[PDB]
Design an enzyme around this catalytic site. Structure first.
Site, mmCIF file in Angstrom:
data_model
loop_
_atom_site.group_PDB
_atom_site.id
_atom_site.type_symbol
_atom_site.label_atom_id
_atom_site.label_comp_id
_atom_site.label_asym_id
_atom_site.label_seq_id
_atom_site.Cartn_x
_atom_site.Cartn_y
_atom_site.Cartn_z
ATOM 1 N N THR B 1 0.847 -1.228 0.000
ATOM 2 C CA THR B 1 0.000 0.000 0.000
ATOM 3 C C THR B 1 0.857 1.243 0.000
ATOM 4 O O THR B 1 2.060 1.150 0.210
ATOM 5 C CB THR B 1 -0.897 -0.049 1.254
ATOM 6 O OG1 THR B 1 -1.665 -1.271 1.157
ATOM 7 C CG2 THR B 1 -1.907 1.122 1.356
HETATM 8 C C1 LIG Z 1 0.278 -2.587 0.286
HETATM 9 C C2 LIG Z 1 -0.158 -3.275 -1.040
HETATM 10 C C3 LIG Z 1 1.525 -3.368 0.792
HETATM 11 O O1 LIG Z 1 1.163 -4.679 1.273
HETATM 12 C C4 LIG Z 1 -0.911 -2.501 1.331
HETATM 13 O O2 LIG Z 1 -0.356 -2.493 2.660
HETATM 14 C C5 LIG Z 1 -1.977 -3.644 1.355
HETATM 15 C C6 LIG Z 1 -3.079 -3.211 2.368
HETATM 16 C C7 LIG Z 1 -4.518 -3.422 1.977
HETATM 17 C C8 LIG Z 1 -5.548 -3.115 2.883
HETATM 18 C C9 LIG Z 1 -6.888 -3.437 2.572
HETATM 19 C C10 LIG Z 1 -7.203 -3.978 1.322
HETATM 20 C C11 LIG Z 1 -6.174 -4.284 0.407
HETATM 21 C C12 LIG Z 1 -4.839 -3.966 0.720
HETATM 22 N N1 LIG Z 1 -1.366 -4.863 1.895
HETATM 23 C C13 LIG Z 1 -1.386 -6.109 1.325
HETATM 24 O O3 LIG Z 1 -1.538 -6.312 0.123
HETATM 25 C C14 LIG Z 1 -1.120 -7.294 2.248
HETATM 26 C C15 LIG Z 1 0.405 -7.427 2.579
HETATM 27 C C16 LIG Z 1 0.677 -8.059 3.964
HETATM 28 C C17 LIG Z 1 0.766 -9.453 4.118
HETATM 29 C C18 LIG Z 1 0.956 -10.013 5.404
HETATM 30 C C19 LIG Z 1 1.075 -9.180 6.524
HETATM 31 O O4 LIG Z 1 1.140 -9.748 7.803
HETATM 32 C C20 LIG Z 1 2.436 -10.104 8.330
HETATM 33 C C21 LIG Z 1 1.090 -7.782 6.359
HETATM 34 C C22 LIG Z 1 0.873 -7.224 5.081
HETATM 35 N N2 LIG Z 1 -1.579 -8.557 1.647
HETATM 36 C C23 LIG Z 1 -2.520 -9.333 2.249
HETATM 37 O O5 LIG Z 1 -3.086 -9.003 3.285
HETATM 38 C C24 LIG Z 1 -2.875 -10.666 1.619
HETATM 39 C C25 LIG Z 1 -4.138 -10.546 0.728
HETATM 40 N N3 LIG Z 1 -3.129 -11.662 2.668
HETATM 41 C C26 LIG Z 1 -2.436 -12.830 2.760
HETATM 42 O O6 LIG Z 1 -1.443 -13.083 2.085
HETATM 43 C C27 LIG Z 1 -2.936 -13.870 3.741
HETATM 44 N N4 LIG Z 1 -1.875 -14.800 4.227
HETATM 45 C C28 LIG Z 1 -1.826 -14.829 5.729
HETATM 46 C C29 LIG Z 1 -1.676 -16.231 6.394
HETATM 47 O O7 LIG Z 1 -2.284 -17.271 5.601
HETATM 48 C C30 LIG Z 1 -1.641 -17.388 4.314
HETATM 49 C C31 LIG Z 1 -1.858 -16.100 3.465
#
Ligand SMILES: *[C@@](C)(CO)[C@](*)(O)[C@H](Cc1ccccc1)NC(=O)[C@H](Cc1ccc(OC)cc1)NC(=O)[C@H](C)NC(=O)CN1CCOCC1
Ligand SMILES: [Cl-]
Ligand SMILES: [Cl-]
Ligand SMILES: [Cl-]
Ligand SMILES: [Cl-]
Ligand SMILES: [Cl-]
Ligand SMILES: [Cl-]
Ligand SMILES: [Cl-]
Ligand SMILES: [Cl-]
Ligand SMILES: [Cl-]
Ligand SMILES: [Cl-]
Ligand SMILES: [Cl-]
Ligand SMILES: [Cl-]
Ligand SMILES: [Cl-]
Ligand SMILES: [Cl-]
Ligand SMILES: [Cl-]
Ligand SMILES: [Cl-]
Ligand SMILES: [Cl-]
Ligand SMILES: [Cl-]
Ligand SMILES: [Cl-]
Ligand SMILES: [K+]
Ligand SMILES: [K+]
Ligand SMILES: [K+]
Ligand SMILES: [K+]
Ligand SMILES: [K+]
Lengths: 248, 201, 238, 230, 233, 213, 238, 216
Positions: B1
């Site tokens: 993000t």
């Molecule tokens: C930018 C793109 C950088 O990551 C943003 O922070 C974005 C935030 C956001 C908020 C709301 C809607 C869309 C986007 N973040 C992500 O894209 C985020 C990156 C992330 C991953 C893990 C973290 O914890 C340590 C912190 C940040 N991506 C995700 O949340 C993805 C969709 N989720 C997963 O990969 C889920 N995992 C978790 C455990 O199980 C296996 C997969």
């Protein structure tokens, strides 16, 4: 089950609590207990109800309890309930000390126990504590203080008050004699013996039948003493000698 | 993000990117990172996606109840504080969420930043995400309290677009809002790369 | 009486009055009729209105794809029992992937309904149910009461004036086993009709029908969906 | 399956009297008599152990019980209730020893045991104890005698009696008891106070007596009781 | 003396029947289900001209599309109303949609006979709610009005009244209802029936009026708007 | 120690059109370097209007589908209607998040119609972050399916193509093509391809064979 | 735990326990609050202190927060519980939310507390009614009052306790802009309405005033006796 | 179970025309050691479904008792209802996942064979809750050794006679004995049919060691 429930924490049609007022009656049959506030101190004076040639006299007192470095109380009612509350008073006092590292202000300690006694009138379905308490002490805010505790959980700050037997007679006796803002501890000690003598049952008064405790501020330290038998003897006899100078 | 918000004479503007990343892979490139709570409350999202979504929706759930109970709507200060408290209940459990709360209450224009740690501060400017440092640079170089709506739209647009150029994990589109006295109005959903070519003359 | 305020108090005659007082609540509710053929189980219930401006009460409820109920008595106690039955049917499908046999579901009601009758401060369930279901053993009609007792029946009626319906079915009980579905429902409606006073008869607004069997899952027809069954009516005689 | 009553079975009557405590007092006032005497260099506790039949084994159960090395007990009232208080007293004596590594002051045991008695005058679904306790002890080179009762109230005595003829036994002691007795004298005046209320002939099997001194607390053997019975 | 879960020889719970009676002391409230919307109206029952006008709230908002008229013990009602508001927002969170008026009423109806003494929690209910409720709103099944009492029983109503003068207002609605009534006639009728069954004259500050129609959300009427509907007496 | 997870492969795809939704998957269930079964389609009917596709740890996918099934019945008894596509997607988000600290190793995609009859697709992560979109792929070969759809359905990276609306016919071939490509490269994709078409008429299933190596 | 239903409905549909608690408030000391234009003022009476008793302790005017204060009538021991529960809640609303408590919110909490005590097992209702005085953050003055039932309303002026019916009726006759014009005359309005029912003498009157932006003021028995002089100079004359 | 003690190796399953046949060797290993060479890893659940189990034997005996009681409980009601092979399979799946989710798994892989309503049943159950149906089943090393054989025959001939299934199974046990170090030459065959469950006594697969002379 509900067949056996006395329903202790319930309202009466008039809007009053029966068990609380019935507990009040128990206090009346207990020992006369008075507290008087003076300019340079404050004292408790109470009738001993445990009297016999065969009693052992092991403790310093019968009705006077030290609760704190700067606080003492006297009791009237069921003594077992009194022991429970006084032990709790000693605990609340120590918890405050542990937390703030300074002695608990007088009013606050009273308020805390009153909250427990009041809780017993509202929930739990238990009988209330049949005890009235007289607190005397010194804190750094309001100096020398005297307080009264009801089984209702209600409290008030007094300059002079009494609870127990012939209580109403004893207070109206004090109401005439008490000289507001002009009372010294010597004056209050003499008044105590005067009020007791008229109020008590066996008539002549004795050093085995009364108990007196004084709270004074000496050398930057709060000193609490339960008066010795030799001291009570001189207090009774000074009133006796004045009872012989009242005729001509 | 990348996420940004700043206030000026004509309210508060809010701009975010739209990229969602899983590891090194772009999972979503049309991801909505603004939550429209009420007509005059606004929440941005940064960090773990599911954490952001759930918790800011849970804030929104409560901002709803507050209005139905008190019948008078919720303040900006209250909202951001409530979120901080939700974050504090889950301490040291690995929630990753960075959010900014925008709105208009009686106190005027309200801007707040809330952390997953519990951190909560009010200010004129904030930026969250992997591209916050880039968004800050272009924001500060070209900010004044005396911005016009058009100048501010230019700055917030610029700030996200330039951040997305340098940040591996920022891209997609700029989504911008103008917080006005009578609520927010959504300004634009402009492609990031399209702007970068426009700015390149 | 002093043997009638608690379920944990036996009468000297050897009875529990609070169970019997709960059994009165069933009789006060509007009539409901259950009957079965070799292939189908049919519930027919009479909706009631407190006033003409208010709508009619729901009488027939969904339990599962193969089980349906009609209620008589207290609404909340009916809704509570319905939710327990649904939960049991859900747990059965969740664990075994096959529908819970009707016999066993009723046995669970019999066990659950018994608990509150034996504990002080608790009370019996103020509802009686007619249960229509279909399983491996074919169609079933079951009856539950405030007393935890339950019955497997060829046909049954409970509620106000259910005695009239009971006698109708008792004459025609040998008829039902070879009955066509359309003929089976008319039998159920004809018994329900007997419960009503002579002035009034079954209308499209006050009749509810539930059907489950070999052909289809449990279905509730209420208003417009009910008139196909009512039309084709032999007239109310005396 | 069960769950107890949560309401007090001891309440205030309009007179301000907790009737169940006074009714519990009646249970002890009707029990077998018991006497305790503090005697300058020790304490003595004696009771009527008249089982009222020759079929009983007089050696099997005891009424004068040790709580610890230096503390003893007697009662007037209900035997079963007393047993509960003995067991509770012994545990409290050990709880104190484990924490402080010092024999529990008699005063402190009595206070702790009296508090247990108080509970049953306020707690739900229970009746008060129908027993009054007589607790003797030796600590700091001083003899102690205490009385605990159904109220949860406790008293210190130079000498006292309880049970049947507790009023006559008390006046007898007022006249008979003088401070600064020797312990062996106290056993006499204890058995004498017991004779006032007896009814029958005294054998070493009919009565039970325990003593407490600087050497601890022990119950007198039947042979020892016979030698005092002359 | 008996327990709270005791059946009468008749076949009813005493505490429920007595809770029904408590409502007969509450101020009268009327709801009307119009094909183009639902109107709720209630009398405030001012005890003194010192009491603040808008202080009494016997018609409240539960959701954008739902309104609730209350009668009986007002204090009992507001515990149930918060529960109704909590349910809608829990459902919104979980399902991203507005609840139906039937389901909202059904949710409140689940708290019905959840009272008792023994075999219960420390904070479990001791008695029922001395309240009747009129849930009126618009969902995907058009405009709807529901009635609920302490027995837990709930049912849809084309028009219903509850309170002290229940039977009087019920008869007045009975002869003055077409299932084709307009919303103009709907508010009028409720205002006409209200003055007849009351001990006090109809003022602009004396009553609360609410509308839930397909197009616009639940609306609390302002004193000036009330003077336009009280213009047509 | 002991691992509560296994990787079982499977890719799931969904595309939204004007009046249709497509949910497609391979039929391969695998574990390590072995195939468990060749007959394991990942599509599942929930309602006549909504279909789900689950991939990842099959143990989680099985239990989750059963949770949804039960929750669908709970809703309908309580609300007197079917749970809409958008409602199921909203509910799924919450179910997955209740396991935020012990997650379902699962990739869910929801395909159906909204209340206006229009096609709707919902894409999820293992923990419940979701949104609506025109097309999305999830699972072991999602990165293989995505770029081609981005180009053809989204019209991305193109200059003077007239932007033709998506037809069922074209999307069907597109779904077939991306899986044919993925089966050639991903070792966890193969055997057969099952396509579930959601329309106003209902759910129609179609099967096309894939590489069996 | 003690699980007995204390407050239950009567056959006539009355909550006797709640009604008995209203008898307790009617036995309480006279308490009156009135909203002015710029300030709000409370006044409390039936003090009757033995003049052997220190009166700093028995004060019936309590401050709940910086901007909120209250007066009560009835069981003074019950009041202390409610007051300190409201004081804790005042600091929690400050912790959960940045904002200080609105007058309506604290009133709503106290009301919800009292209501909970009428429907919970094991406990009797509170024996107090409250008069809550405060200012909004926007500055508009607010006066509310509660009772044992759990109901609350806003008032222009009000009285609770003994002589409430008498003082209330006085306020209806005497509440116009001629009396509220100044800050002094509103204070005088309290004293006059107070001295109207109490055993006369300004020595038994403790009253509090708070201005829009000023900290709460408890008045000197000097200041109030100065106003008792402006009433007796304008009583024999007027 | 965190660490299994006594384990059993591959269990075999394949369905013929008019029933299902299951094989498992009578060995319980303690690590590499062959501890019990004459113990049964198969049970008859009822008259329609049967079960062979891999992994921890104590967990198998536990599951054997729980399933045993469930069948008894059902027979007591005598309401014309009994557990179908699918129902047992569904229960077992739910049991394993539940135990797995509490981080305390039953260390077993299961093969469930059954015959009901003219249809043959063969279901797989994992210790993690992985469950499916297939015409042929092989657990552990069987999945790498026996399963390829079964599939290659079932491709050429989908329907087998009971005799053909039996000889295919004996052929698979031959491969397993040769290639699995945690196997033994004592095994059982279980069969479901219209007639019910039949478990056959100690069997040995025919071995040939003539390739021992082909190293010169
Ligand atoms: C930018 C793109 C950088 O990551 C943003 O922070 C974005 C935030 C956001 C908020 C709301 C809607 C869309 C986007 N973040 C992500 O894209 C985020 C990156 C992330 C991953 C893990 C973290 O914890 C340590 C912190 C940040 N991506 C995700 O949340 C993805 C969709 N989720 C997963 O990969 C889920 N995992 C978790 C455990 O199980 C296996 C997969
Ligand atoms: Cl006492
Ligand atoms: Cl309690
Ligand atoms: Cl019976
Ligand atoms: Cl009912
Ligand atoms: Cl019946
Ligand atoms: Cl109880
Ligand atoms: Cl004994
Ligand atoms: Cl200790
Ligand atoms: Cl001994
Ligand atoms: Cl009822
Ligand atoms: Cl009603
Ligand atoms: Cl098309
Ligand atoms: Cl706090
Ligand atoms: Cl509470
Ligand atoms: Cl009043
Ligand atoms: Cl064996
Ligand atoms: Cl294994
Ligand atoms: Cl399970
Ligand atoms: Cl399969
Ligand atoms: K969510
Ligand atoms: K009962
Ligand atoms: K873990
Ligand atoms: K992902
Ligand atoms: K083998």
């Amino acid at each position: 089950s509900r067949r056996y429930d006395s329903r202790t924490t319930i309202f009466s049609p008039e809007g009053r609590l029966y068990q609380v007022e019935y507990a009040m009656e128990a206090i009346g049959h207990a020992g006369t207990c008075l507290g008087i506030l003076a300019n340079d101190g404050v004292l408790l004076a109470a009738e001993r109800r445990n009297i016999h040639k065969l009693l052992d006299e092991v403790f310093f007192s019968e009705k006077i309890y030290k609760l704190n470095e700067d606080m003492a109380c006297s009791v009237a009612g069921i003594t077992s309930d009194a022991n429970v509350l006084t032990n709790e008073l000693r605990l609340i006092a120590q918890r405050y000390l542990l937390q703030y590292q300074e002695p608990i202000p007088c009013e606050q300690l009273v308020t805390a126990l009153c909250d427990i006694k009041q809780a017993y009138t509202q929930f739990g379905g238990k009988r209330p504590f049949g005890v009235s308490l007289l607190y005397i002490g010194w804190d750094k805010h309001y100096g020398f203080q005297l307080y009264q505790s009801d089984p209702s959980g209600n409290y008030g700050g007094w300059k002079a008050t009494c609870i127990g037997n012939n209580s109403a007679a004893a207070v109206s006796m004090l109401k005439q004699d008490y000289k507001e803002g002009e009372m010294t501890l010597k004056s209050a000690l003499a008044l105590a013996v005067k009020v007791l003598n008229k109020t008590m049952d066996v008539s002549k008064l004795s050093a085995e039948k009364v108990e007196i405790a004084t709270l004074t501020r000496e050398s930057g330290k709060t000193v609490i003493r339960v008066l010795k038998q030799k001291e009570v003897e001189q207090l009774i006899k000074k009133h006796e000698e004045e009872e012989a100078k009242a005729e001509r | 993000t990348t996420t940004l918000a700043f206030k000026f004479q004509h309210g508060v503007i809010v701009a975010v990117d739209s990229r969602a990343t899983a590891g090194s892979y772009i999972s979503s490139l049309r991801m909505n990172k603004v939550i429209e709570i009420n007509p005059y409350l606004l929440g941005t999202m940064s960090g773990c996606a599911a954490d952001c979504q759930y918790w800011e929706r849970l804030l929104a759930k409560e901002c709803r109840l507050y209005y139905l109970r008190n019948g008078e709507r919720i303040s900006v200060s209250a909202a951001s504080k409530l979120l901080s408290n939700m974050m504090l209940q889950y301490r040291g459990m690995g929630l990753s969420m960075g959010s900014m709360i925008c709105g208009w209450d009686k106190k005027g224009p309200g801007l707040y930043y809330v952390d997953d740690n519990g951190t909560r501060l009010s200010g004129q400017m904030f930026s969250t995400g992997s591209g916050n440092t880039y968004a800050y640079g272009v924001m500060d170089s070209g900010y004044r309290q005396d911005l016009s709506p058009e100048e501010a739209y230019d700055l917030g647009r610029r700030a996200i677009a330039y951040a997305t150029h340098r940040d591996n994990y920022s891209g997609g589109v700029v989504n911008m809002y103008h917080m006005k006295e009578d609520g927010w109005v959504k300004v634009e959903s402009s492609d990031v790369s399209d702007l970068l070519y426009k700015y390149g003359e | 009486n002093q043997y009638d305020n608690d379920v944990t108090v036996w009468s000297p005659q050897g009875r529990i009055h609070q169970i019997e007082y709960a059994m009165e609540a069933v009789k006060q509710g509007s009539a409901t009729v259950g009957l079965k053929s070799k292939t189908h189980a049919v519930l027919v219930a009479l909706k009631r209105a407190q006033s003409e401006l208010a709508a009619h009460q729901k009488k027939i409820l969904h339990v599962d794809n193969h089980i349906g109920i009609s209620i008589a008595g207290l609404t909340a106690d009916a809704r509570l029992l319905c939710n327990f039955m649904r939960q049991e049917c859900l747990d059965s499908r969740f664990v075994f992937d096959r529908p819970l046999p009707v016999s066993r579901l009723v046995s669970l009601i019999g066990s659950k309904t018994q608990i509150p009758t034996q504990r002080y401060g608790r009370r019996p369930y103020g509802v009686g149910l007619l249960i229509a279901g279909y399983d491996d053993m074919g169609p079933h009609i079951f009856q539950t009461c405030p007393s935890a007792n339950y019955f497997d029946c060829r046909a049954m009626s409970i509620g106000a004036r259910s005695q009239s319906a009971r006698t109708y079915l008792e004459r025609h009980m040998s008829e039902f086993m070879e009955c066509n579905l359309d003929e089976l429902v008319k039998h159920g409606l004809r018994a329900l009709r007997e419960t009503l006073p002579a002035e009034q008869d079954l209308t499209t607004k006050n009749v509810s029908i539930g059907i489950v069997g070999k052909d289809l899952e449990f279905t509730i027809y209420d208003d417009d969906d009910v008139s196909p069954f009512l039309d084709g009516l032999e007239e109310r005689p005396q | 399956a069960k769950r107890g009553y949560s309401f007090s079975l001891t309440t205030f009557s309009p007179s301000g009297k907790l009737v169940q405590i006074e009714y519990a007092l009646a249970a002890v006032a009707g029990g077998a008599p018991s006497v305790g005497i503090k005697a300058a260099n020790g304490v003595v506790l004696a009771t009527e152990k008249k089982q009222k039949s020759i079929l009983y084994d007089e050696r099997s159960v005891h009424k004068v019980e040790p709580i610890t090395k230096h503390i003893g007990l007697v009662y007037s009232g209900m035997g079963p209730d007393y047993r509960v208080l003995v067991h509770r007293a012994r545990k409290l004596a050990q709880q104190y020893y484990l924490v402080y590594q010092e024999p529990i002051p008699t005063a402190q045991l009595v206070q702790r045991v009296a508090s247990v008695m108080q509970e049953y005058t306020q707690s739900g679904g229970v009746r008060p104890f129908g027993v009054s306790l007589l607790i003797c002890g030796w600590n700091e080179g001083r003899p102690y005698l205490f009385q605990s009762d159904p109220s949860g109230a406790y008293f210190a005595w130079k000498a006292t009696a309880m049970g049947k003829n507790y009023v006559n036994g008390k006046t007898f002691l007022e006249k008979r008891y003088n401070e600064d007795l020797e312990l062996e004298d106290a056993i006499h005046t204890a058995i004498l106070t017991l004779k006032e209320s007896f009814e029958g002939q005294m054998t070493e099997d009919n009565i039970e007596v325990g003593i407490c001194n600087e050497a601890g607390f022990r119950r007198l053997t039947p042979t020892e009781v016979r030698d005092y019975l002359a | 003396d008996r327990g709270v879960n005791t059946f009468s020889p008749e076949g009813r719970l005493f505490q429920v029947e007595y809770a029904i009676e408590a409502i007969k002391l509450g101020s009268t409230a009327i709801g009307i289900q119009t094909s183009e919307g639902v109107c709720l109206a209630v009398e405030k029952r001012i005890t003194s001209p010192l009491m603040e006008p808008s202080s009494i709230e016997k018609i409240v908002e539960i959701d954008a599309h739902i309104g609730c008229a209350m009668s009986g013990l007002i204090a009992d009602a507001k515990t149930l109303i918060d529960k109704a508001r909590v349910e809608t927002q829990n459902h919104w969170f979980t399902y991203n949609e507005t609840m139906t008026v039937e389901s909202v009423t059904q949710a409140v109806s689940n708290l019905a006979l959840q009272f008792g003494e023994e075999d219960a929690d420390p904070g479990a209910m001791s008695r029922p709610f001395g309240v009747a409720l009129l849930f009126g709103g618009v969902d995907e099944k058009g405009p709807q009005l529901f009635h609920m009492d302490p027995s837990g029983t709930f049912v849809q109503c084309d028009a219903r009244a509850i309170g002290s003068a229940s039977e009087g207002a019920q008869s007045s609605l009975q002869e003055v209802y077409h299932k084709s009534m307009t919303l103009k006639e709907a508010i009028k009728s409720s205002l006409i029936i209200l003055k007849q069954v009351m001990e006090e004259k109809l003022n602009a500050t004396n009553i609360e009026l609410a509308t839930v129609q397909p197009g616009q959300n639940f609306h609390m009427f302002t004193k000036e708007e009330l003077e336009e509907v009280i213009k047509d007496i | 120690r002991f691992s509560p997870y296994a990787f079982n492969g499977g890719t799931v795809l969904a595309i939204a059109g004007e009046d249709f939704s497509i949910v497609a998957s391979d039929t391969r269930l695998s574990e390590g370097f072995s195939i468990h079964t060749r007959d394991s389609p990942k599509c599942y009917k929930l309602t006549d209007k909504t279909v789900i596709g689950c991939s990842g740890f099959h143990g989680d996918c099985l239990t989750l589908t059963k949770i949804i099934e039960a929750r669908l019945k709970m809703y309908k008894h309580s609300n007197n209607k079917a749970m809409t596509t958008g409602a199921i997607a909203a509910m799924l988000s919450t179910i997955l998040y209740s396991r935020r600290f012990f997650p379902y190793y699962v990739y869910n995609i929801i395909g159906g119609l909204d209340e206006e009859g229009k096609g709707a697709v919902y894409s999820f992560d293992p923990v419940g972050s979701y949104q609506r979109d025109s097309f999305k792929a999830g699972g072991s070969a999602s990165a293989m399916l995505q770029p081609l759809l981005d180009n053809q359905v989204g019209f991305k990276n193109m200059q003077n193509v007239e932007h033709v609306p998506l037809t069922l016919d074209r999307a069907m071939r597109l779904v077939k093509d991306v899986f044919i490509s993925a089966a050639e490269r991903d070792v966890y994709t193969g055997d057969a391809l099952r396509i579930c078409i959601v329309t106003k008429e209902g759910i129609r299933e179609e099967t096309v064979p894939l590489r069996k190596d | 735990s003690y699980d007995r239903a204390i407050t239950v409905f009567s056959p006539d549909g009355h909550l006797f326990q709640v009604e008995y608690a209203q008898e307790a408030v009617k036995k309480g000391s006279t308490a009156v609050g009135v909203r002015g234009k710029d300030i709000v003022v409370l006044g409390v009476e039936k003090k009757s202190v033995a003049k052997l008793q220190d009166e700093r302790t028995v004060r019936k005017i309590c401050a709940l927060d910086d901007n909120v204060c209250m007066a009560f009538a009835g069981l003074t021991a019950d009041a202390r519980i409610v007051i300190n529960r409201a004081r804790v809640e005042c600091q929690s609303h400050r912790l959960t939310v940045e904002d200080p408590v609105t007058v309506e919110y604290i009133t709503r909490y106290i009301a919800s507390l009292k209501q909970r005590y009428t429907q919970s097992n094991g406990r009797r209702p509170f024996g107090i009614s409250a008069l809550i005085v405060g200012f909004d953050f926007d500055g508009t003055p607010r006066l509310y009052q509660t009772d044992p039932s759990g109901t609350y309303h806003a008032w222009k002026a009000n009285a609770i306790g003994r002589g409430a019916k008498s003082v209330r009726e006085f306020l209806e006759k005497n509440y116009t802009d001629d009396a509220i014009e100044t800050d002094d005359l509103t204070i005088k309005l309290v004293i006059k309405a107070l001295l109207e029912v109490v055993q006369s003498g300004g020595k038994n009157i403790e009253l509090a005033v708070m201005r829009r932006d000023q900290p709460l003021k408890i008045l000197n028995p000097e200041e109030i006796e100065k106003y008792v002089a402006e009433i007796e100079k304008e009583k024999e004359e007027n | 179970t965190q660490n299994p003690m006594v384990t059993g190796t591959s269990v075999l399953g394949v369905k013929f025309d008019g029933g299902v046949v299951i094989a498992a060797d009578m060995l319980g290993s303690y690590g590499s050691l062959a501890r019990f060479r004459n113990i049964s890893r198969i049970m008859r659940v009822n008259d329609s479904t049967m079960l062979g189990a891999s992994g921890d034997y104590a967990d198998f005996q536990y599951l054997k008792q729980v399933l045993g009681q469930m069948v008894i409980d059902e027979e007591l009601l005598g309401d014309g209802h009994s557990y179908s092979p699918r129902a047992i399979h569904s229960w077992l799946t739910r049991a394993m996942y539940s135990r797995r989710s509490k981080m305390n798994p039953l260390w077993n892989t299961m093969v469930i064979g059954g015959y009901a309503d003219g249809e043959s049943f063969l279901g797989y159950v994992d210790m993690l809750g992985v469950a499916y149906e297939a015409p042929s089943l092989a657990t552990g090393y069987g999945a790498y050794l026996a399963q390829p054989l079964l599939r290659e025959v079932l491709e050429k001939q989908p329907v087998l006679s009971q005799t053909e299934a039996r000889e295919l199974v004996e052929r698979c046990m031959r491969v397993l004995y040769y290639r699995d170090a945690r196997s033994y030459n004592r095994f059982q065959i279980a069969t479901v049919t219209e007639k019910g469950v039949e478990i056959e006594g100690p069997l040995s697969a025919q071995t040939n060691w003539d390739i021992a002379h082909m190293i010169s």
